[PDB]
Ligand binder design. Sequence first.
Ligand code: SF4
Ligand code: SF4
Ligand code: ZN
Lengths: 382, 181, 184, 72, 109, 71, 126
Amino acid sequence: NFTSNFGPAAHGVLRSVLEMNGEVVERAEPHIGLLHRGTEKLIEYKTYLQALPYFDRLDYVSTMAQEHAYSLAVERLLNCEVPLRAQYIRVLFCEITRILNHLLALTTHAMDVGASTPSLWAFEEREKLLEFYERVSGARMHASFIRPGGVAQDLPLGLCRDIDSFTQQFASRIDELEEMLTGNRIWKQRLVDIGTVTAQQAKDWGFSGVMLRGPGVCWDLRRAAPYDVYDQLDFDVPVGTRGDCYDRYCIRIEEMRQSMRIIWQCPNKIPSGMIKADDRKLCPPSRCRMKLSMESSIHHFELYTEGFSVPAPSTYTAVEAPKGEFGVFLVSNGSNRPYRCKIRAPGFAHLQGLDFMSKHHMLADVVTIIGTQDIVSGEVDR
Amino acid sequence: TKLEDEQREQLAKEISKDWSSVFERSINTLFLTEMVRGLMLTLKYFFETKVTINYPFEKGPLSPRFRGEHALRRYPTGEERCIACKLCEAICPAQAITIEAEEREDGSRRTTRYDIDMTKCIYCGFCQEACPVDAIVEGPNFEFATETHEELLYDKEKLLENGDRWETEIAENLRSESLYR
Amino acid sequence: MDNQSIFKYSWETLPKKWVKKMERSEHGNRFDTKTDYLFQLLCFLKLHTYTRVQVLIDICGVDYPSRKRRFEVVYNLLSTRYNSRIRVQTSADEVTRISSVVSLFPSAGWWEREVWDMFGVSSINHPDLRRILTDYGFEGHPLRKDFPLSGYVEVRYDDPEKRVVSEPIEMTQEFRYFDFASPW
Amino acid sequence: SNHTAKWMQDTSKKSPMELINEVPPIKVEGRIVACEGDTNPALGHPIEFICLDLPEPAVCKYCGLRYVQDHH
Amino acid sequence: KPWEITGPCADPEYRSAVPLATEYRLQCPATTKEKPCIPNSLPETVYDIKYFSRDQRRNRPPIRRTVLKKADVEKLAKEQTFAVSDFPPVYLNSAVEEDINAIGGGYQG
Amino acid sequence: TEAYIRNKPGMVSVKDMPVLQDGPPPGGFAPVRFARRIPNKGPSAVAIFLAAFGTFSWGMYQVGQGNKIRR
Amino acid sequence: AKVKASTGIVGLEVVPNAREVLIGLYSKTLKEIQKVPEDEGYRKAVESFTKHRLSVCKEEEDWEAIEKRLGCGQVEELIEEAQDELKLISYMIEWDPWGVPDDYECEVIENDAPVPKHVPLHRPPP
Ligand code: SF4
Ligand code: SF4
Ligand SMILES: [Zn+2]
């Protein structure tokens, strides 16, 4: 049994070591500490409103579902309701983020396997969506836009019209991409029956997201525990019949289309009203009030110096991120700094997956497995 | 693996119903019609126009809610805006601001040293939200790519004051964000 | 308002010998148990044909540097069939070999290695292999309340003297700590 | 002379203090004023009602404008 | 055009991805032709501020604790009795093998 | 701290005070498309097979006539 | 009629002997819990519901009908659950823990802290 190394597209930094035999991967094992930062230690020596950008930095492809999960955790721990327009725009952008992540993962998978034109077309579409981000608030990626209790700024005018234009042209673009890949005998023979996963060992190794929904078992948090407006937003939730690379791929495309259905359902129901709060003790007052009234200045000052204090208990909060069940565990006590905020990105489950499900294959199939897993070492290590 | 033998039989007994079906599927997989379809789509995109923004002459689209090279504005009278609240330093999530003040001679309070080591300053935005007088702001300039770390350690307010070379442009943005912010 | 059913049934049919505390909150239902029966309790679940959990979501450590039992291990795990999740939370001190669950849920080797180096809590059976997250030979366990934010020895720079080296910390612009507290 | 010497370096163009002394007083008519500039937002400088019952100008503590009562 | 015989390029419900200036963004984000006044409060609050009744936060019940001994354990074990029903409920859901063009003629969403 | 800021001009009560102008126009802009649709309109089986076989036979006949000329 | 097409899950494999295997498994579990363990708790529960499921499968006798009436996912999934339950019983009697000796505290804690409706909570299945 050879002992080969694998230190590679730019599909992240990761160190695979492979006990090999001929062209068979008898045992693959990843070394993962290669990008560590101490995000939990920092959050602790930090705060709530100051630690939001950390969640923005974890899993840096899907750059808003993380803030959405952290905001849900703080609200649950805090009992701070949020207005309907805030909920609606927040779901809208969570779904745009899902589409972003799916484009990137799917077409980077296509590049690992060998295609390139899908990568470039998907990256054009990603440019459009990132333009939506940077128009609404902040830079292209890492838009710290979902604070505890709602959003930071209202969205501009015309953004909905642009959303609609993108919706139509993007239905067409997904159709093009699927025609380009789904059905090409090369892609089919390269993807199908590569990395089968029975639901028993799926639930054992603790997969989530598309992975868990690949082979059989039909369970996503949006339908099970519908955290946000999602009820009024009926959708489809596809499910694969024989868990493997091809079925996870088709799941991803159907999830893109369902996300389009949601992204249209929102700008038809969005209830024009207020955003983000009704207490200038958990959400800071806007500029006019802050510079005209008196107690608004007191609350702005206290809220940007020490932040809000949340009570004693500890909670767990999960969100259907584009990858899987992104989890946050808060152990806050009294004071304004989050005691022991623990992350539960699905990267760990997916890498142990790689370990067991990458046996008795070839190195091209190892690359294919990483592709279909859609790993981001940022979130797997944090 | 006994079932796979049984499954592969039915799957063949199902699609191979008539002769037309087998013949069609065979010359389908034998004349590469999906290959031809992919090639034709590709050739269409080839003939079609491009994107290729041609950077150094026509830059990309932005939004007044942009974040970039910081700046310290000042009143129309030429009088500085910053008053040393320490709010920007307090809310800095990266602690990338250092600020040290003193009572001036005429009486008003101002900043003796104010610096933002731009690197350690990730560009998050909280600056322009904590300021009660709109002193510090993020002008829409992203072309500053010096060749020595020390520069990106923007100096003790001096270069930050020179952000006023954008004072017109920045001003525009602020007006368009006075409504909803 | 979520999973009173599974929790109630699990508590009313359990062998009540090995349950030290039960909390039916609305944040999350807690079975605080003794570290001696943890494997027994978890193997009861995942097998009983009503409260079958079958998936372990997280194994996180919490540090309380003011109690005799310093650490706190926590297992967050759901039931995909019965749409419910519970949080089994055990206590653990400095060196005290805690049982493993890699036999039941194979998805704990990585989470148990992570709780081996981040914290210092041991693990008697297999999963206590070498460290995972922290880089290499590392002095402390860098997530308790003692390992400072900037680390003991962390300067790491190139040396044309030889090649590259790791030397003790002499960082500039020391970490400022603001107070912000509020006596009401 | 010392503060602007601590922060400013050029000493060719006039310092902020010099400009805000170059602007003359306002000579308002009543007994109480409020300094922002000309807009309520987008110009900051929250309301800073300042009395005018002394024979010398009164500074504003943001953007010192030195209002002065006109008549007796 | 020579391709135009099969694929999305030969479908009347097909759109390209080169949105012209006038049709995509005819109003720049800065100087719009309107004047938006975002809401920030409800009238009831803005003229009847009352922060405890608004801040039902910190208005939560206290944490209630109880200890149990062998006597109470035995009593509960005896009084307790299961039933053929309401053990827990089950959360069952299965595949359906639905089409694609169904919902709203395959359009609305 | 909200009345005139939000809207000063002419209202008699706090209700019906502001003008918002935030969301979509009346109608939902469209019904949009989300389902795939790839028409299959190429010559399916017998057309292409007869094309291949006929052009092969005729090309062979032409090769024959040409080799006659060359001889 | 209508033997089966596919259970829908990848790990489970259909079996036409659903009724017979369920009868055998349930009889065995009834016998095991009937003779072996002490008459408390877990034993009470398992006796009750297992004899229930035995009776209902034996009476319905048509696997479609046994699913539709018993009200659980699939006969295969029920087979899995029964096998796992019997395995659990074996483990339990290997390390028989029944009976609280004395000096026993089980602190029941409860706080009714209200949480908003827009937070992920596993709403009960109807
Ligand atoms: S908040 Fe504004 S004026 Fe106040 S100390 Fe900072 S930039 Fe300076
Ligand atoms: S932009 Fe953010 S990172 Fe930079 S100093 Fe200002 S508040 Fe901090
Ligand atoms: Zn002034």
